[PDB]
Amino acid sequence: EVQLVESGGGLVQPGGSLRLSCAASGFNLYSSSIHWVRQAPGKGLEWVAYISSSYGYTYYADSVKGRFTISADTSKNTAYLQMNSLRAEDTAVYYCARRAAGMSTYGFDYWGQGTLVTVSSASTKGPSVFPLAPSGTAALGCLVKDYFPEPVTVSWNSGALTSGVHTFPAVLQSSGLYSLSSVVTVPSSSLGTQTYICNVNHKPSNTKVDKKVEPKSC
Amino acid sequence: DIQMTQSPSSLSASVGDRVTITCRASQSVSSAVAWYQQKPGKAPKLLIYSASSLYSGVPSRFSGSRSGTDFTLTISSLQPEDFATYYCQQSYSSPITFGQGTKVEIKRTVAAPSVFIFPPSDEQLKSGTASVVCLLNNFYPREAKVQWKVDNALQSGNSQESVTEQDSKDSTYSLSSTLTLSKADYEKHKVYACEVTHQGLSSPVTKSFNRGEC
RNA sequence: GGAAUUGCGGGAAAGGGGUCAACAGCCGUUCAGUACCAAGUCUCAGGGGAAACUUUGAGAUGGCCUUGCAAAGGGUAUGGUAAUAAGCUGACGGACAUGGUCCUAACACGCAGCCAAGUCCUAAGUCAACAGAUCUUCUGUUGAUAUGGAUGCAGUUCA
Ligand SMILES: [Mg+2]
Ligand SMILES: [Mg+2]
Ligand SMILES: [Mg+2]
Ligand SMILES: [Mg+2]
Number of domains into which chain A is organized: 2
DSSP B211: S
CB atoms within 10 A of CB A141: 30
CATH number at residue A156: 2.60.40.10
Instruction: Using the structure, give the distance in angstroms from the CA atom of B126 to the C1' atom of C69, rounded to a whole number.
Output: 75
Select the residue from B5, B135, B136, B181 to test the A interface by mutation, using most A Cβ atoms within 10 A: B135
Output the CA B30–ligand 4 centroid distance in Å: 29
Output the CA B145–ligand 2 centroid distance in Å: 58
Q: Distances in Å between the alpha carbon of B120 and those of A111, A218, B88, B209? A: 41, 11, 45, 11
Query: Are residue A19 and residue A111 in the same domain, yes or no?
Result: yes
> Which residues share a beta bridge with A86?
none
Please, is B112 exposed, middle or buried when counting C-beta atoms within 10 Å of its C-beta (0-12, 13-18, 19+)?
middle
Query: Are residue A36 and residue A65 in the same domain, yes or no?
Result: yes
Q: d(Cα A137, Cα B138) in Å, to the nearest integer? A: 13
Solved using: X-ray
Q: Domains, chain B, ranges and CATH? A: 1-108 (2.60.40.10), 109-214 (2.60.40.10)
Residue ending a domain, choose from A65, A93, A121: A121
Query: Are residue A177 and residue A116 in the same domain, yes or no?
Result: no
> Which residues share a beta bridge with B54?
B48
Output the CA B50–ligand 2 centroid distance in Å: 14
Residues A14 and A208: beta-carbon distance below 8 Å: no
Cβ contact A218–B209 (<8 Å): yes
Cβ contact A169–B164 (<8 Å): yes
CA atoms in the 13 A half-sphere facing the CB of A134: 23
CA angle A44, A50, A56 (to 5 degrees): 170
| Residue of B91, B123, B162 lying closest to A171 (CB–CB) | B162
Query: Are residue A92 and residue A129 in the same domain, yes or no?
Result: no
Of residues A179, A83, A177, the one with CA closest to residue A124: A177
Output the CA A180–ligand 3 centroid distance in Å: 61
Query: Are residue A158 and residue A50 in the same domain, yes or no?
Result: no
Alpha-helical regions (H) of chain B: 122-126, 183-188
Q: d(Cα B107, Cα A197) in Å, to the nearest integer? A: 34
Residues 6+ apart with CB under 8 A from B156: none
Q: d(Cα B41, Cα A37) in Å, to the nearest integer? A: 14
Query: Are residue A92 and residue A135 in the same domain, yes or no?
Result: no
Residue ending a domain, choose from A121, A136, A152: A121
**Ramachandran bin of A115, using left for φ above 0, alpha for ψ from -120 to 50, beta for the remaining angles:** beta
Instruction: Using the structure, give the distance in angstroms from the CA atom of A61 to the C1' atom of C65, rounded to a whole number.
Output: 23
Q: d(Cα A186, Cα B116) in Å, to the nearest integer? A: 13
Select the residue from A68, A129, A152, A168 to test the B interface by mutation, using most B Cβ atoms within 10 A: A168
Of residues B68, B84, B81, B82, the one with CA closest to residue B33: B68
What one-letter code names the amino acid at A63?
A: S
The DSSP annotation for B75-132 comes to ESS--GGG-EEEEEEE-SSSSPEE---EEEEEE---BPPEEEEEPPPHHHHHTTEEEE
Q: Which B residues in the span 127-156 are in contact with A, Cβ-Cβ below 8 Å?
A: 127, 129, 131, 133, 135, 137
Query: Are residue A89 and residue A184 in the same domain, yes or no?
Result: no
Query: Are residue A109 and residue A10 in the same domain, yes or no?
Result: yes
Q: What share of chain B is helix, strand, coil (3-state, %, to 5)?
A: 5, 50, 40
Cβ contact B164–A218 (<8 Å): no
What one-letter code names the amino acid at B133?
A: V
Q: Does B95 touch chain A (CB under 8 A)?
A: yes
In chain B, the residue whose alpha carbon lies closest to the alpha carbon of A111 is: B43
Residue ending a domain, choose from A89, A121, A153: A121
Query: Are residue A202 and residue A147 in the same domain, yes or no?
Result: yes
Q: Does A180 touch chain B (CB under 8 A)?
A: yes
In chain A, the residue whose alpha carbon lies closest to the alpha carbon of B157 is: A174
Hey, which bits of A2-127 come out as E strands? 3-7, 10-12, 18-25, 32-39, 46-51, 58-60, 68-73, 78-83, 92-100, 110-111, 115-119
Chain B residues whose beta carbon lies within 8 Å of the beta carbon of residue A113? 42-43
Q: d(Cα A112, Cα B20) in Å, to the nearest integer? A: 28
Look up the domain containing A29 and give its range.
Answer: 1-121
Query: Are residue A95 and residue A3 in the same domain, yes or no?
Result: yes
Query: Are residue A199 and residue A138 in the same domain, yes or no?
Result: yes
CB atoms within 10 A of CB B183: 15
Query: Are residue A73 and residue A48 in the same domain, yes or no?
Result: yes
| Residue of B50, B174, B180 lying closest to A106 (CB–CB) | B50
| Residue of A130, A168, A218 lying closest to B213 (CB–CB) | A218
At how many Å resolution was this determined? Answer: 2.0
Residues 6+ apart with CB under 8 A from B124: A128, A130, A143, A145, B130, B131
Question: What is the total residue count of chain B?
Answer: 214
Q: Does A2 touch chain B (CB under 8 A)?
A: no
Q: d(Cα A82, Cα A124) in Å, to the nearest integer? A: 22
- State residue B56 phi and psi, 5-degree precision: -70, 155
